[PDB]
């Protein structure tokens, strides 16, 4: 007899809804962001019927670079107190292990979740730690856990089209990401984090007063 | 009262069976101090310990059983035999491998008296040196701090390969070559077991006199 | 102290086939033997035990020797092949134990602090769960006797083991398994009524033979208070049900509905399915 | 003589053999516990009788039989590093004073740390979030070790301790769970306080990567600086960072959360050397005549390492003239003197190699 | 099946791999966790189909 | 268990094959019990257990387990209704994942491949749910009168 | 003061104030008579509390003893009026100390039971605790008759 199948002993997942994280009231993107966020991130969640009618695929992917200013998870924070969500928090080096074993089990467990139930938005924190690709045999530890980037990047593929599913993504180094994580198919939605400059100096003055 | 010695023959057989648990251990272990009782759910009371192994798995055995948990602070090199998983004695000494013992010299064949036009110079070594072994209970007195670190440095040849060590008859005190390439290993975090190892073992063998040779180039 | 014990099939057979050695040599008295245990918890258990030669004489029937040479020595060869293993009483078959079990019991106290003895029945015959147990305590007395030492009864339970089951569950294999939910409840309700009544009307017998003789025991009182405990209802002529009427029927309420309800749906998958089944293969075979 | 008896008695039980240990991981029902042994396979297995509720945890370590691998009894999880950490020792106390300045970094430190343990009140009625680290580099001066090291040894049994040294551990070893492991004990003993000294090593940067063993220090940097500057809260713990240069800290190192306050020290000035003298002529014998002013004035721009060795230096001239009280003239020779062959052998300041 | 089970009991039915054939009559066998072990006849596959 | 013994190995020179009575040879010979058993029947030979009668205490060894495993008296016993909640929960939540293949028999028609009997084993898990809840209910009137 | 708190039941309402009024003349120490019944505006709130406690520790134990009981006869128990039970009956239903159902068209009112939903805790009662004694009958009973055996 098999499992249920479960999420196993990776991750592990939830304890994002514990609660409280960070309140959207401090920015939220108001009118502007919560725009582009709205149809490309919380519409997906299901919006079954609308994008039938219009023949577009809400594509899942959502790209965060930049920092300063930080946003990122204080973004899928943000998003938590709007809608009541399971979130996947991770980081890109902390699931390499001793084992490699896990590792077709971890991309399965985390992507089964967003497709058989979806309050669901997975954030991975600075990706680039994986994106380096390493020759060298000895660093197959290295090797596998960026097949296991490469393996949830063909699950998202498995995954169109459509219904569902939902990541956002976020890193502070775009130039060692491999050419086919942004490669069009995948993320047809990049969202550049602008520099906050002077207009949110006065917001963030406005937030700690 | 004659029935020690029929009960002195159990514990000589049953010793008997520890000299079979003597011959031999394919096991290492290392220790992990614990205590745990549980409630039930008449009563059982006691103490274990959480013990490791060198083929990588962890065990789980009662408190030893025979030397008690009195003594010592979680260490290694215990012996485990086979499946009994018993400890019977916590043999010395520290670790590990070739990373114990670098290398075992005694005496120079030279002298502090071959040089000359270093008078002056050598002395501020040989003072360094000499001075915390008889001078220490004078020490205490004033209460001064021996030196520990000295530089020996010059266009080469200079001498202070044989010099240096010359010095180490003088002080009567043990002398072990070491080098800055000594301290290089193949893998990774090496160098930092192989000097707290040789200060374990210049701790437990007296004040000696140790020598590295290079160390501007591993200290660049 | 001792709240319950564990007696396994293992140790029972240990005294069943001394049965066999004393049987056929003879002559007198019965099986008796020192019993090893096993103290995990409260509740003790026994796995394996020794059987010692044993005697006692009629006229001269406070008689008894154990062999404390064939006790001291063999407990160390029990002691050497299992560590946990140690006695913790002696035993015998019975069936009925006789006054002088309390010289047995305070000679072997030095052993153990308390000793519990272990009646068994080599022949099961009734009226029930077989052989007993008892524990030694001092109870004293209310008519004013010096201090007396009566062995109280132990609740005694059967019980199984890893790898214990090997032989003894395959040599049986006449026994229909288990069958839970048809046969298994019901044949019990005829046991539970024969038990239960049997002894009822033995006891109640009792009870009217104390009026002619046997006074004492009076006794006192556990027999008509956890009678009266029985008496919380009786149940007499009738029922008295007025009040549990119509909630007797109120839990027949969704017992009968899930039988009507799921039946039907079971019919619907018998029926159909078969029909279906039945026609394929009937008229497409000619 | 039945001590011996109770004895090999007490050794027959120690027939009984070991078992091993392993991690819970979940539960697929009451008769199958899903538990990883410390070699990484996973089980499924029953449970015996003896044990009770409080053995199934979420996710804590067990001891599984060596037959059907049932579990005994169930133990706290510790790796223990920790015990090691605790190891270390210092006196002060009065060592906080002693240094003497900057009198405004004195005064500093003992309100970062000491406030918040007292009084977190004067955070929630204000609505501030305290300061959760520090950082204290060198060497411009001295102080780093000892004043942080003060308040730890004097916090007794609350602390912790890093040595660069641990970070590399061995090949093939994991320190990733060694960074979450050193913040998950600084959330349980409170206020914790970490010390991480000499970073240059293993703060490695990612522009520039060597070999293979450049990316095992970026993911001990990347676990960093996620617990830092987490979303895991750290607010209640106070984390201490040195490094002789902060060339190699990034962006993230060098921005505030993971590294909140950075007090570059300052060496001693002809002001605050007068107090560090007092306390250096305290455990040295001294002629009746004494000029504090004499040694502060020849030696200028010294460390406090270099004007406490160099002043036992002092004294061991002071020896060679083998006087008991000896008069700062012979002082002031061996002070000068040393100070100064001190000065034309390393390079720095200010001039880099 | 409980036969054929009993087949499989002992250590397991494991899956081999040949990285190459010998002439000597045995036949290399590779387990993926393990290293490159290998075997002789086995005369139900002949060495030439190998 | 298991039964075996050594034959000399000097006896190479002489037959290898005895013993008379070939019917509890061929009976012991087969399973075979998997290889290395018979690899090493090299130097030794298996030899038959059978079982004289013990049924005198065989008897009681049937009575002893099962009257003490029949509700401890028989009587004790006699999880309930929560179980019959947790069972309808079995005779329903079950019963409509079972009957949508009868709807996937019909498909319609026929691309799928076929047959397919879907019936048991769940239908006489049913039979035997309502057999227990109504025996079950039965002891309200075999206790009372 | 325990014995009110201990086993409960009732009092005459007059006997405590017969015992707490005389502990104003009571004294040596006047100070526990002063802060409490030396106060009028402050004593007089403690007096009316001094009503809540003996009505709200007397609900407590009603509530365990109901089942039902009539208006009337809740009045003649708490030794006050009919409207000062329903004002102490309004002020102790909003602290949810006890739920309640009060029917005053015909005076019977009831603290609890909500209306017994349910079935098979009837059934779980009844079968578990009295069939199980028995069943526990043939235990000690035979046990009990190897007892008198053993002596007549
Ligand atoms: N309204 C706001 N605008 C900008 N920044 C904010 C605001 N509110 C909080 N922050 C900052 O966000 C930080 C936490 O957010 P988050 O966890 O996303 O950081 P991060 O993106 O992981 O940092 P880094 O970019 O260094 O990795 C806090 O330290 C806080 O200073
Ligand atoms: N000033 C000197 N006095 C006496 N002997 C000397 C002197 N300089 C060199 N030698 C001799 O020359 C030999 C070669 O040693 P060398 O001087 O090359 O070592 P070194 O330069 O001191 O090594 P390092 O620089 O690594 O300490 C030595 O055996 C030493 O006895
Ligand atoms: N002002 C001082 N008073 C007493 N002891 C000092 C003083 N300064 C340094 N020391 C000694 O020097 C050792 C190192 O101290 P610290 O870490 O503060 O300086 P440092 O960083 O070693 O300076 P540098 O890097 O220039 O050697 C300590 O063990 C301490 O005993």
């Not at chain 1, 000895?138 to 569902?164: C, K, W, Y």
């Not at chain 2, 310990?49 to 003594?71: H, N």
């Not at chain 4, 090999?8 to 078992?19: F, I, M, R």
Request: proline content about 4%; charged content about 25%; glycine content about 6%.
């Amino acid at each position: 007899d098999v499992l249920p199948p479960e999420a196993d002993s990776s991750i592990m997942m939830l304890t994002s809804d514990q609660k409280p994280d960070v309140m959207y009231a401090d920015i939220g993107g108001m009118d502007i962001q919560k725009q582009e966020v709205r149809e490309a991130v919380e519409l997906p969640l299901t919006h079954f019927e609308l994008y039938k009618q219009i023949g577009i695929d809400p594509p899942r992917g959502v790209l965060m670079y930049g920092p300063p200013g930080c946003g990122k998870t204080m973004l899928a924070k943000a998003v938590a107190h709007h809608t009541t969500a399971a979130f996947i928090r991770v980081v890109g080096s902390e699931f390499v292990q001793k084992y490699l074993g896990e590792g077709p089990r971890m991309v399965r467990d985390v992507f089964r979740l967003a497709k058989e139930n979806a309050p669901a938005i997975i954030f991975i924190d600075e990706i680039d730690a994986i994106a380096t690709k390493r020759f060298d045999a000895q660093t197959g530890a290295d090797r596998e856990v960026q097949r296991i980037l490469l393996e949830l990047l063909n699950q998202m593929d498995g995954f169109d089209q459509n219904v569902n599913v939902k990541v956002i993504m976020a890193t502070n180094r775009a130039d060692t990401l491999d050419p086919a994580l942004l490669r069009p198919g995948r993320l047809d939605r990049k969202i550049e984090f602008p520099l906050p400059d002077r207009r949110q100096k006065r917001l963030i003055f406005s937030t700690i007063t | 009262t004659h029935e020690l010695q029929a009960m002195k023959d159990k514990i000589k057989e049953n010793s008997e069976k520890i000299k079979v648990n003597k011959t031999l251990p394919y096991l290492v272990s290392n220790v992990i101090e614990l205590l745990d009782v549980d409630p039930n759910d008449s009563q059982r009371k006691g103490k274990c310990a959480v013990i490791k192994t060198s083929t990588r798995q962890t065990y789980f055995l009662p408190v030893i059983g025979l030397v008690d948990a009195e003594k010592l602070k979680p260490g290694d090199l215990v012996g485990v035999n086979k499946d009994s998983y018993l400890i019977l004695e916590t043999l010395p000494t520290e670790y590990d491998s070739r990373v114990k013992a670098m290398e075992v010299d005694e005496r120079p064949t030279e002298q502090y008296s071959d040089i000359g036009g270093l008078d002056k110079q050598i002395q501020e070594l040989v003072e360094a040196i000499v001075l915390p072994m008889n001078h220490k209970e004078k020490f205490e007195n004033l209460g001064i701090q021996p030196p520990k670190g000295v530089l020996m440095y010059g266009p080469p040849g200079t001498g202070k390969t044989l010099l240096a060590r010359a010095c180490a008859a003088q002080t009567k005190a043990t002398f072990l070559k070491l080098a800055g390439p000594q301290l290089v290993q193949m893998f990774i975090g090496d160098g930092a077991k192989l000097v707290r190892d040789a200060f374990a073992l210049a701790k437990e063998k007296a004040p000696s006199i140790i020598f590295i040779d290079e160390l501007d180039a591993i200290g660049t | 102290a001792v709240q319950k014990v564990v007696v396994h099939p293992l140790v029972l057979l240990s005294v069943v086939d001394h049965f066999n050695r004393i049987g056929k040599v003879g002559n007198q008295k019965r099986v008796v033997g020192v019993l090893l245990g096993s103290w995990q918890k409260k509740v003790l258990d026994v796995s394996n035990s020794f059987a010692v030669p044993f005697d006692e004489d009629d006229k001269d029937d406070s008689v008894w020797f154990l062999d404390h040479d064939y006790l001291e020595n063999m407990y160390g060869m029990f002691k050497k092949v299992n560590a946990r293993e140690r006695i913790v009483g002696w035993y015998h078959t019975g069936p009925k134990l006789h006054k002088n079990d309390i010289a047995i019991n305070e000679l072997m106290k030095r052993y153990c602090p308390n000793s519990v003895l272990v009646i068994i029945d080599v022949k099961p015959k009734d009226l029930g769960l077989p052989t007993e147990a008892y524990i030694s305590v001092e109870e004293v007395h209310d008519d004013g006797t010096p201090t007396s030492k009566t062995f109280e009864h132990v609740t005694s339970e059967i019980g199984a083991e890893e790898a214990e089951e090997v032989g003894v569950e395959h040599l049986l294999r006449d026994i229909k398994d288990t069958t839970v939910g048809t046969l298994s409840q019901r044949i019990t309700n005829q046991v539970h009524g024969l038990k239960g009544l049997n002894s009822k009307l033995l006891d109640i017998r009792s009870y009217l033979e104390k009026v002619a003789t046997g006074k004492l025991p009076i006794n006192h009182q556990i027999i008509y208070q956890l009678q009266d405990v029985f008496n919380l209802l009786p149940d007499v002529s009738l029922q008295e049900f007025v009040k549990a009427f119509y909630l007797k029927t109120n839990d027949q309420m969704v017992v009968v509905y899930l039988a009507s309800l799921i039946r039907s749906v079971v019919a619907l998958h018998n029926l159909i399915n078969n029909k279906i089944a039945n026609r394929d293969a009937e008229k497409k075979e000619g | 003589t039945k001590q011996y008896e109770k004895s090999e008695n007490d050794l027959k039980a120690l027939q009984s053999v070991g078992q091993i240990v392993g991690e819970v991981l979940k539960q697929l029902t009451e008769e199958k516990f899903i538990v990883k042994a410390t070699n990484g396979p996973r089980y499924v297995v029953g449970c015996r009788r003896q044990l009770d509720k409080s053995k199934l945890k979420p996710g804590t370590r067990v001891a599984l039989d060596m037959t059907t691998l049932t579990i005994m009894r169930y133990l706290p999880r510790e790796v223990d590093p920790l015990v090691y950490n605790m190891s270390h020792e210092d006196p002060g106390n009065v060592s906080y004073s002693e240094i003497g300045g900057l009198s405004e970094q004195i005064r500093e430190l003992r309100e970062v740390i000491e406030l918040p343990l007292t009084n977190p009140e004067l955070f929630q009625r204000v609505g501030i979030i305290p300061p959760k680290g520090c950082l204290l580099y060198g060497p411009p001066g001295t102080g780093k070790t000892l004043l942080a090291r003060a308040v730890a040894s004097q916090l007794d049994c609350n602390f912790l301790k890093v040595v660069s040294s641990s970070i590399v551990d061995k090949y093939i070893g994991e320190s990733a769970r060694l960074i979450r492991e050193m913040f998950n004990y600084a959330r349980d003993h409170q206020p914790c306080i970490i010390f991480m000294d000499e970073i240059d090593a293993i703060g490695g940067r990612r522009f520039s990567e060597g070999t293979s063993a450049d990316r095992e220090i970026q993911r001990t940097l990347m676990e960093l600086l996620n617990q830092m500057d987490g979303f895991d809260t750290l607010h209640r713990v106070k984390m201490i960072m040195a490094t002789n240069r902060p060339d190699t800290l990034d962006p993230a190192l060098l921005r505030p959360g993971r590294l909140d306050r950075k007090i570059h020290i300052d060496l001693p000035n002809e002001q605050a050397r007068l107090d560090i003298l007092k306390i250096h002529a305290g455990p040295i014998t001294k002629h009746g005549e004494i000029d504090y002013e004499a040694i502060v004035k020849l030696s200028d721009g010294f460390n406090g390492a270099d004007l406490r060795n160099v002043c036992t230096e002092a004294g061991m001239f002071a020896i060679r003239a083998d006087h008991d009280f000896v008069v700062q003239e012979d002082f002031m020779k061996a002070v000068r003197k040393v100070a100064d062959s001190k000065k034309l052998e390393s390079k720095l300041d200010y001039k880099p190699v | 099946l409980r036969e054929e089970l009993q087949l499989l009991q002992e250590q397991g039915s494991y899956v081999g791999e040949v990285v190459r054939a010998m002439d000597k009559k045995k036949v290399l066998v590779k387990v993926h966790p393990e290293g490159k072990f290998v075997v002789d006849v086995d005369k139900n596959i002949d060495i030439n189909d190998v | 268990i298991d039964a075996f013994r050594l034959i000399n190995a000097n006896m190479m020179v002489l037959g290898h094959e005895p013993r008379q009575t070939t019917s509890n040879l061929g009976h012991l010979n087969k399973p075979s019990i998997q290889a290395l058993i018979h690899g090493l029947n090299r130097h030794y030979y298996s030899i038959t257990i059978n079982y004289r009668k013990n049924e005198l205490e065989q008897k009681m060894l049937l009575n002893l387990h099962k009257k003490s495993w029949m509700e401890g008296l028989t009587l004790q016993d006699y999880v309930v209704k929560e179980m019959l909640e947790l069972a309808k929960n079995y005779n329903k939540a079950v019963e409509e994942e079972d009957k949508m293949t009868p709807e996937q028999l019909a498909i319609k028609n026929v691309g799928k491949q076929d047959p397919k009997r879907h019936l048991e084993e769940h239908v006489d898990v049913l039979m035997t749910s309502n057999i227990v809840q109504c025996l079950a209910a039965m002891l309200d009137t075999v206790v009372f009168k | 003061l325990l014995k009110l708190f201990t086993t409960m039941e009732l009092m005459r309402w007059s006997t405590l104030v017969e015992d707490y009024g005389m502990e104003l003349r009571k004294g040596s120490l006047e100070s526990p008579a002063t802060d409490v019944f030396g106060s009028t505006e402050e004593g007089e709130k403690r007096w009316k509390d001094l009503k809540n406690r003996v009505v709200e520790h007397n609900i407590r134990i009603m509530a365990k003893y109901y089942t039902r009981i009539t208006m009337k006869r809740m009045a003649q128990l708490l030794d006050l009026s009919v409207d000062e039970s329903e004002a102490f009956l309004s002020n102790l239903v909003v602290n949810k100390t006890i739920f309640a159902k009060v029917d005053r068209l015909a005076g019977i009112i009831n603290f609890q039971r909500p209306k017994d939903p349910n079935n098979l805790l009837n059934d779980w009662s009844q079968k578990l605790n009295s069939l199980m004694s028995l069943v526990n009958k043939t235990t000690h009973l035979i046990a009990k008759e190897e007892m008198i055996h053993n002596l007549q």
